[model samples]
Target chain A: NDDLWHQWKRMYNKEYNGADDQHRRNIWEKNVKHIQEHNLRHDLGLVTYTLGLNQFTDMTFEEFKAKYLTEMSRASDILSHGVPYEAVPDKIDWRESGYVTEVKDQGNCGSGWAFSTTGTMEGQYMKNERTSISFSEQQLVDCSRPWGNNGCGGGLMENAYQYLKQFGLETESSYPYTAVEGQCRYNKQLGVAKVTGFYTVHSGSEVELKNLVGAEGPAAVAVDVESDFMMYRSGIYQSQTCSPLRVNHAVLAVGYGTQGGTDYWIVKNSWGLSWGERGYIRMVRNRGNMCGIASLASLPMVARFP
Target chain B: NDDLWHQWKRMYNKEYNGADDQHRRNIWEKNVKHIQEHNLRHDLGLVTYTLGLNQFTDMTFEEFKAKYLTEMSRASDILSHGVPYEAVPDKIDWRESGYVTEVKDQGNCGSGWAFSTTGTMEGQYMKNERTSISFSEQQLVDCSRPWGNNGCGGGLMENAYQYLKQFGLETESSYPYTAVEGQCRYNKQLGVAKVTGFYTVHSGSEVELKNLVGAEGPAAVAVDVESDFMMYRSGIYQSQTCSPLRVNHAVLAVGYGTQGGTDYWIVKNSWGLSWGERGYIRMVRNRGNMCGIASLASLPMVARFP
Candidate 1:
């Protein structure tokens, strides 16, 4: 246990307090055992997803949620329907087409909503502009606070879209992420992308969400993130007890496809490249609306690149 | 076994021969068992490296060597020494400084020597030219055969350096890698990089190689690769059974560092990004010259960008 913890700490460059090192090591040991037990069932085909170790392995689930998640609301009353499904292809990956940007990290901040907001807008801008641009999440985190979008505490994609429509979003270089709250430094001259508007998917409609992702580009979505979700390594994630009604963490739905008869939604996470299949999770698709992926989905509209 | 094999094949997008599907699956299953057993020792701190499944898991060790490795010779008689040993830093990674280009795939080609040659030249050019450029490996593979360097069957870094010093190497876009031998299409107009000369590291001297990497840049090196080396996923690799006399594969020594009191050399491979730690491996360092990493190390001299 000591050797593995030491090696894991070195691998991830995890720093610990000298006095509390043992305490954290114990937590990591327990988590490792749980992960091994879970994978046994995974090997037996009892579970769809397999969990692996990462930066979050040392932290307890409660600590993870406290630092990285918060209570947020999504408005489902006003919804925009997508184009009618015109016999869509069996699969589509905007990533393959260079619409989706590289996966980013949110650090210890509850700024996943900001990343999801930027991700969708970046995709929309790239789709129309025929060129890729990394829109600044820091712009939304710092400048959209007046519009009910919190900096690092929590926020909503809808509010972020509204802020972008009015104030516009700058390039990542002009306003790089610091992973913490800061004074608004909005620069109109550096603003290169702005949304014409936004669309909220029909609640609980998986077909509508799938059609939108396939026909258009990536979309902003939130899901109920369990402790195991933090440990996700690979495979189509289909949890048995995760509550869809308790959606908390935001993510980007990039694409969808089938693997060995199992359908999955290619969802991008904001947990850096070292996490889950290189910052992506294949969530179970068309399986009772797994994780409530379609419950609170959204996308931005980009008529032009500003 | 059937379930795991199908999942593996789907994960890696492996196409199987209809009648030979079971035959390959059996091989994969055996490899998986060996990998698990190896990793057990890794977890117990008895082994330094851990093995994982990749596209190579289905191929036997002999098949892998025949397809990827090559027999090459290094001229240690004409060796060059580096700066006098001063107090060097504890660690240095050329990758962090952008001297090293993206990890490339040699595909089914035995052109690792070409890659190692280009990698060292790329680093030297970047260090002096003040800009990074991807030199063409296809140029060396197609045109350097007359210099005693085989295209796909085998090759040597010294031969490639000699070829570059005379003919110069073009940009990747000018003569992109096809992973196969082709007719020479050397474009002197597009040729952007060439070596004035090259320096072979003092044979069996790890300190000299380390100094060259830290003071200069990455160097072309070769190693004695074992079957487990092919399965390396992560950690400082130190196999008990791997030979030091029989160097077979060419790679680039990028940097060196110590992990958990174990000194290691950060070596870059040409086997795609999915292998090892994103196409790099941490081979044991200063421990009886592990893998003959320093025995055949050399670097090129870039006096000018042209």
Candidate 2:
């Protein structure tokens, strides 16, 4: 209990602004309760619960969604399911291939979509030729705004791809990652990688997503990051409380697996190494394509000739 | 282990059909394992796992969605939550208010939307002037085609309400409920109740839904019912594996509550009292409108003086 109080004191002072004295005390009490609840469930519940504290402490489910999420276009209507399909491999982790990029952090910006897009680009680029590359997420964050993205406020991996298709992508060295969407300070010579184009994996099909990850590389997928996700520490992170209709955050799905019987997706988040399982999470999959994972899986077309 | 097999034999024989013997055996084996896994999470998992044996058992998530769920209309793109707006209630149960009708089964027909619409009508009618008013769901099923319903094949509650609006609802005594859609055999003389209009309880807002339910009666809502949902029997139901973008089934939300620290909506499914908690379920809520409870919540206008 005292341990959580210390975490909140340092936490609220740095990131959790706005809450006053009484509200702060109330949030601290609730945060402790949430942590205990999550730990108990993880230790004994049907599904393991991810627990920790960073942001989203004290906030209700409604409060969390209202603060973090943005509009994600599901122009195509496809429903994924509760059964297994596509003969998904028992497991697939691109990180083991050395093509997987290092863990990233997004600061205070709502730029998970940008990170996920770049992460996919990096992974695909490695599969095509060079095993080493750091793409410019800032370029997309700033320049891709014209392509229907809101910079740091929120964006879609698809829109970011549309931006890449139009004007290609640059390296992080040429244009480094800025947590916030800044004014495009472009350098023509800085442009490096060539993302010819990208296509969506089979919508609502986890097996298709797995096939691509196994045969190709990591795929950027938009998913529901609810209050539970904020504190996720481990296990097959899934919450029935989270809506599949909403895609507030963008993250890269690197692989998949079955833990003891629970099926899960290996997703690399951009909240740094200290966040989840080393800046990665294993999300529950094969159950109705939960959280619309397969519904929004995407990646660039790896062109070796170009 | 033997106990589960006995339950599976009973379950498969009943409602579960259209599969080969080998397919049935493999699925039963997997399902038995799934129950044991879930049972470890909750003591009631075994019973909860026996909600139904349907077409989803042998299919993967992709197969189920591709085969069953239809395209849902998300025309209004309002995001559900993260900010505090309308004040949601701590809890509410329409059943306690006396407007809730007894559970009605829809059998093999996919006409759940029709029943939900009628259930809401019955509740509102009691609030207005009637105590025991049974409305004609068959008329809605048969005549609502023009409004975009597929009769017994599958229909939308919104379209059913539209049908009720264009030509007031008829009495059950006059038309009666016939599970499937037949020829447009509507008799205008048999119509009794006048549904002046209908309006949605603001998109993705539980507070709005609660206010409506408390002020009016039961609300008709559509939601994505996955293979897991098909098997749901008891316990607070929430699935991370299902998507909210597809609502293939419709039901009535009698109220909301919190059980064992989980917030849930009191929903009345049309599959009967033998389904979930006597044809009712407490669905997880306030977690991004999990399962689209707030995403697809709606209520038909009830007339008191007209």
Candidate 3:
């Protein structure tokens, strides 16, 4: 619990600034105050911190509320709007294809970008029309070795995608995980494949991504960081501050659906089942760039088959 | 990937055995095997490995099947069988209690017993009396330090209960966490509480526990460890073998009702929301001794206030 709390604090400190900090801190302080005040008279029980980033520009609270409700209704409709054809394969053995690997926690590595990319590659490989081979993100992480970053500091998804294209990546079976910081020892002896090309999108367009998801299987995206996110447990989180201070890592977009009148996208995370929704997150869908999913500018390049 | 795999292999080898070993090896081998066998001909999907030890063992497979079907027949019945219900001031706010806290992870500490105990304790406190205090497992782990074995070791719930009876425990806040092996500093300053008293039952007897729970609101129970428990994911877990290997923890049985024609007890767990239906488990109820709950041999004690 101490370790988890500190980890979250670090992210919170790194991710927010002035106003964002003030707003989030205010919420935290308010909750703490509430607890202190209520503990004596009323039982507050176990209080949980929720993280949400609302993105509404130049609008009053009332206007935001109205728009939110209208958009939420539309989002629900869109979520129910299934694809005409199945975007996923006829049969999916998540484990065999490396889509669902054993728990490999990043700890403080902040390598969410690598996990997201690697997961997508695994899924796409299996779902692809040609030969399906599990791809490795470790190859990208180690070989890329981009500078101006601490080991556990952070990186972006675009950089990872670019690295994969340049290096002609290997499989996770070859590179493996060390979890701790280490020098890049590019194993050229390992099998490699050439990349044909890739695509991009605006990170702020969740609605477009939702539409795309309906047409496709899953897509990758980025999001804003919140302070309470450090202590997030479970349940729907609704917030209006979509501040993007700490763009530490990335994750994959899987399915989308609605719960309690609100629409959300079911995203698979690499934090393992011990994390959110058994290694998943349900982000509000149809919001701006699907909550900056539009910011996912770099697209995947098609890999050449042997 | 190679480094990560190597690290995981080492950890897997050192931390677990038997089916756990097979479960880990299966992750790598199964993928390769599938690729070798079918290439792309077979329908590859995620194969959920349901561990048996995590479930109740009193009922026959036929009984469990019927219960599941009955529960699904009624929408509200879903919560009736295996759902956890706390009296108003529930700890760990419901909104923030999704899946952040990871289960099956005690960080080398054999404190699962503490977690299970505290979980049911919280449930009983809240549901039975409407008090919402997230009791401290850390207090139990640290204070009961002398009672249980060392980290990476084992202990019994019965012994733990005795330790609680002698020394009233503290809250998690007062004692924090480290997730590593350390000395047992029984802070006499953080004086112990005098336990009001405690109760008992046989293992695998759900009927007795259920009667106790219905009449008394939650009862702790012990269960035989199933072999395949090393791979339990989500879903209804059923087992034929009720092998009692290590009885190291205790949890609360909050409520019980029939589901799909099968009776189940809504057992509360302390492993957090990420595990077993938001820190709860469903056990076959109404068999003898409350469907193996008798194994727990439960007894409730009050903490002497001031």
Candidate 4:
């Protein structure tokens, strides 16, 4: 269909940011029936599909977990603290050791919990020996608007990793990622990466999250992303139609694998890379752990990496 | 040391295009003692070490396979002629279903074989039935220059799958990619995607290239990247200082898994996101068939999707 009408005017731009001429022709006819049901479930894991423009196709998983998840209960049992002990080798990746950073898009912001708390403090400052830097998730959505969090309307990566273990986060080229909710532009002298403490990976093991993503680096999760993960675009993802005790979205898992033989988990998504599998997502690791991804994993226990 | 001297002038202004004089401060103080002997051999796999400046760090793996690998033996045995039966799906990823794309940087072009042969013909025209297009590699580096291919000097994904089974490709927003070797902006009515035949998987099988990336989606590998895959910045990679039959670059695997239990593959690159693990790299999978990732696997059999 003319390349799905030029990918629906490069996604909902519909000759001028649509919505009106009959609600943009009923969301372009429900995005041409969600691209013909993503081409007959394009061989299982719905290779990729989606109709209208994001916000889980006009909200419902209870208005996207009441606008971007964040109850923060015993925030993973008030953080299952640390200790990883080596040897889970075979595989691991903090973006293969520079420690995760790039993928950022959180645009229509509900600030994916301050970019999942500066991606668990730059993968816990590149796991111990820190190097590649960039932190400031807009100083945790404008200095957690008076500790009640919620900058772009939603927050909590254990209160932005306990406000970067008492104020720190800067240098994402010095406070970048403007997926909006702005203001506090902190500046602990343009910080570098710190996090005195936080942890919690042993929630009914997927081999203890394959031994904590091979002993340390990339954790802070929370899924149940509904609307079938807003058009996933790649595979391993799983669902029996989500809602299993909601937890909208806030990502970063970073590693774990298996294919055709199942097992998976990599994740990482502040959206953008045109969403999923580019922005990243793998999910469905060891069934039972399904969507909860071993119940909100979390991790950020290093004090400094400067 | 101040983020290692600002990542050593951001990797010697990414090595060479370097600005600061004083003989680039003695080649960035020997790339900061090659990043402190790569942070004390950060547990082998160089954890992530690279100071930029390319052309395989001043040659000799037989002069980088006679200048960027190209004897192109029957382009992976004339595309291992098709046939990949069902049931391999434990998890597949043709980039979650839009059939992988986006991640092109073959700059300093040895034209990663026309961007890994137009990323296996736009992931085989989004698998059989297509949508959401974008194919051109500047018409395979100016019309496969007299068949020996070499546009930016280097070619072969089985001769870009026999020059897109004879002319066809154009749509990086209309022949967009300009990673140098340019000129033949061809016009098969500004084709969007095409390749009537191409395949090849059974090469020392990693479960037959994971049942051809779960029955065909992204495959066109070739490896030997080395210099520890130029500071990869992530994991599952394997090195022992690379060389086996010196295959030099050309990527696209798009999926495979195992982390912490090692086994990898995922591949996909053309060097951009400041090099590996963001542009993409994972490697390792079934070791025996290590870096010749099952020695030159291939794919591209669409014929039409317009």
Candidate 5:
């Protein structure tokens, strides 16, 4: 245990000392025990996903929710018109076609709402013009305060898209992502893309989200981030304990496919490249709207990039 | 202890569990003891600087050095001709005049070499044009591989300037920083700044460095990073345990002044805004080359930004 702690510290570039150090190490030990025990259940065919030691492996579930998540309340809404879900392909990966931009890291901020909103805008822009332009999440985090989005404190994707529809979005190169809320430094001249409006997927309809993701483009989605979900490393993630009503984190639904005869939604996270599968997760799809993946999915309506 | 540990974890967004948690918590306890003891010495006027708990508070001295620091070596050099240091101003802050770019975070990469290099180049360009354009440290980390830079592993400022002189540097927005070495996506068309050459300050000469930084702009300089130095929070930092011959990290000398009758150099760090007084440090200046802050200082000669 001592050797692994040292090893893990080096691996994550972690440094700590003092009574607090002992306290954190104790927390880490408990988290690792839980992760390993849960993975053992995976071996026993009792769980669908496996957990691993990550930056979050030191905190309890309560602490994780308090720090990384916010009350995902919908203060705004725009019902997306019904789209046909017929004749859709069994699988699709937008990353294969270069519609999805690179996965981003949201750091300690609860700005996943902005990330999910930008993902939809980026994918939609690339879909229209076959040219990828990373839109600015920091702009929304900083400039969307007047529109009810609370920057790092947390936000809703619907409010974020409303801000984008009103103010437009800047290029990632121009506005950039600071992972923290700052003064709104938006330059309308630097705004390269604007959304006409936004739409929300029908509640609890994985088929509709799949139709949008597979046939249209990526969409903003919400999910509950439990302790196991926090340490999710690989495999089809399906949590029996996840609270659908308590959807606390936002994510991007980029694509979908079946693995080992089990359907999965390819979801992209804003936790950077180190989390999940290079900043992505395969949530169990078409399975009773797991984790509320289809609970509050959203998308931006971009007419063009210019 | 438990309450404070939970509080600190929440403040830093830390999460951990398992045996490793106990191990790390032990380490944190030890580090806190050392930091408090050292700070107590500061109260006794035995030390010039005070230590505080930061992201580095959990690791041993050896771990801090091995992960964040690298060997400082001069692979190439162009001796800057003697410049008279007579009658120079007692103080100058280029940041106040907008010559330096915003403090940047280098993440886990030992690319302080690149940060220092870009700092000098960015300062020089902004000094000449009065327009700040953040240069790409990732460009130097990526494209300068053939010129003896090991990217995140480690590198030299002189070698980086040579690469800039040869191929030029791209804007930060176009090439952006990934904190990890990746394929060189440098676009010559996106190249915005080029250095004519670079000049190295005389070994162990702090006056020449001050003269350069005061008159020309910020200059990349080398320093030895120790454990105490790692957790430095504020005040004029002077270390008794630092070795001049073991200079391992590069930083920018933005200005120099006196505080509390203590002479100090205003140095900029690449560890981001979370560190060191909004990403800056005031090192004990004119005190026999402390931390080797004047050791191996170099600056690029930028003819123009366009």
Candidate 6:
């Protein structure tokens, strides 16, 4: 029935089409093939639903392809279903999970990447000095340069990590949010901190990540492309698959676990709970590069001990 | 076909073996009867859509009937095809036709009633002083208490007008918005400059009110029973009917006019452009207690020159 549904969709596309279908299919097959190759080599169970003609519905063919490949790569990095983590897990207690001095919802602003990086910085500060401190995402949102993203649109996590290395982060309560875009008043008098260190993970590696996250409290990670993320109303999204290309947001990986032998990662999202599952995403693990989990980028905050 | 649809619906209700079939039929009959009665006396048109069914499938027969009657009475207040003031004959340019200020959008907060009262105060001050002053809705929203409703819900324009008469109004920039609910900090340091008194309409009649609004730039009026108003997303809502239940909101009656021989009053709404046609509602004029177009509230700011 599912195959029949796909066949019906294919027929529908061909019957009422006015675009380049061949180029679209070619790109999709190539990416799917690439994902299959990556999965075979890594023993990652990264399954993607966005292959074939379904990819060419709205977006340009190239955009569709790019999104597909990027998602595949991201998912591939996280798909570690077969290869297990051999490291000894240093399980951290929840109460001693390093006190998060402040937690704020990002309020419709797709600045999750900024929040994720800043949160990790705070966690690192606590972990090293054993003292909790809240850092400002607004400062990163305003000052971080060459990242090629604005406040309302989206941002890159890797670039953000790199930016923080140069300019330390600040406190959100200090700068405050107008919730409207204005000229960034980058108060340089506001100081920057250094990145003590950072780590990167491959996609579909949920078991390894579980070990890492259980040891450390949280880690900054990226999931596969999700565009309708802007309009996500509310629900535990188990059915809908990720977009192939537009991997726009970055979030903090708070925890990971297995339920019914299907893996899932507990991620902290940025959009205020006024939008979705209270600003949290329970993403399917062990599928499509561990649901593009390889994009996890974590950097420890350097501590200044008294 | 319409009759057939109704008959089929009724048959379906009766025969489809539902537990509440009899109750459902009774409610439906009551709704039809109410519509017929309303149509005979007043032209309610599409405005009936705004009267939200509080408990459509959930209510008991008596509860449904009560809610239905209440909503029907509320819908009867809308003027029949009332034209906007801009469409009115010999329309006086209110901005140049007298004192007018820059249009303001009240974002997401249900603070329209406060803004309406404040706008009128600003206009009255300008008219008396031969100079315009921007009074603050924030001040009114914060302090026009026991009178104006707070941030969560709304209250009557008449109540706000009465509050102004006794306590006077404050400028906006004086008391900044914290954007969170807390104890009202009515700072006497932010003095309320008393005016040379105020005035009210006799029994809040629509005709007398129209004449007053035409003579004056805008008047603060309390509207009756606006439902689905909470769900008002966008568009030019032209309705023949209005509701009668009193849900008080203060709005500036900027101007009035007639379209296709049907009178309409143009009122400025507080919700931002994203909410409606740039925060404005044009309802039928001189109908249903004249669109609750009652009571004129005015104040003269203290004279600056000796």
Number of the predicted model whose TM-score against the real structure is largest: 1
Candidate 3 residue spans exceeding 4 A from truth: A1-103, A129-135, A146-151, A192-194, A244-248, A289-291, A297-299, B1-263, B266-306
Q: How good is the docking of model 3, by CAPRI class? A: incorrect
lDDT-wise, the better of 2 and 3 is 2
lDDT for each of the candidates? 0.82, 0.70, 0.45, 0.64, 0.79, 0.50
DockQ-based class of model 2? incorrect
DockQ score, prediction 2: 0.01
- How close is every model to the real structure, measured as TM-score? 0.55, 0.47, 0.40, 0.24, 0.49, 0.35
For residues A188-284, could you state the per-residue lDDT of candidate 6 as single tens digits?
5564456644555553455666666676567776665443343233322343565423344577777655555666666666555433445565566
lDDT of residue A292 for candidate 5: 83
Q: Which candidate has the top score in DockQ?
A: 1
Candidate 2 chain A: worst-modelled 10 consecutive residues by lDDT: A79-88
User: Which of 1 and 2 is ahead in lDDT?
Assistant: 1
In the range B1-306, model 5's lDDT, one tens digit per residue, is 465555556656777779577877888778766655554344324568756666666678798677668878543333443222224689988888888888998887889999999898888888787786898999988888888889888898878777777676888888999999999987878888887866667467788888877777788888998877788876788878886777899999999999778889999999877567778889999888998876678877886535
lDDT for B91 (candidate 2): 79
Q: Rank the candidates by lDDT, best first.
A: 1, 5, 2, 4, 6, 3
Indicate whether candidate 4 or candidate 6 has the larger TM-score: 6
At residue A239, what lDDT does model 1 achieve? 80
For this target, which candidate reaches the highest lDDT against the unseen true structure?
1
Off by over 4 Å in 6: A1-98, A101-103, A107-109, A147-151, A179-192, A225-235, A243-246, A258-263, A289-291, B1-306
* Ten contiguous residues with the weakest lDDT in model 6 chain A: A42-51
Native-to-model Cα distance after best TM-score fit, residue B278 in candidate 2, in Å: 40
Encode model 4's per-residue lDDT on B90-174: one tens digit a residue: 5566687888877877655667777887887777776666676657777788888776777877777776666666676777887
lDDT assessment of candidate 2: 0.70
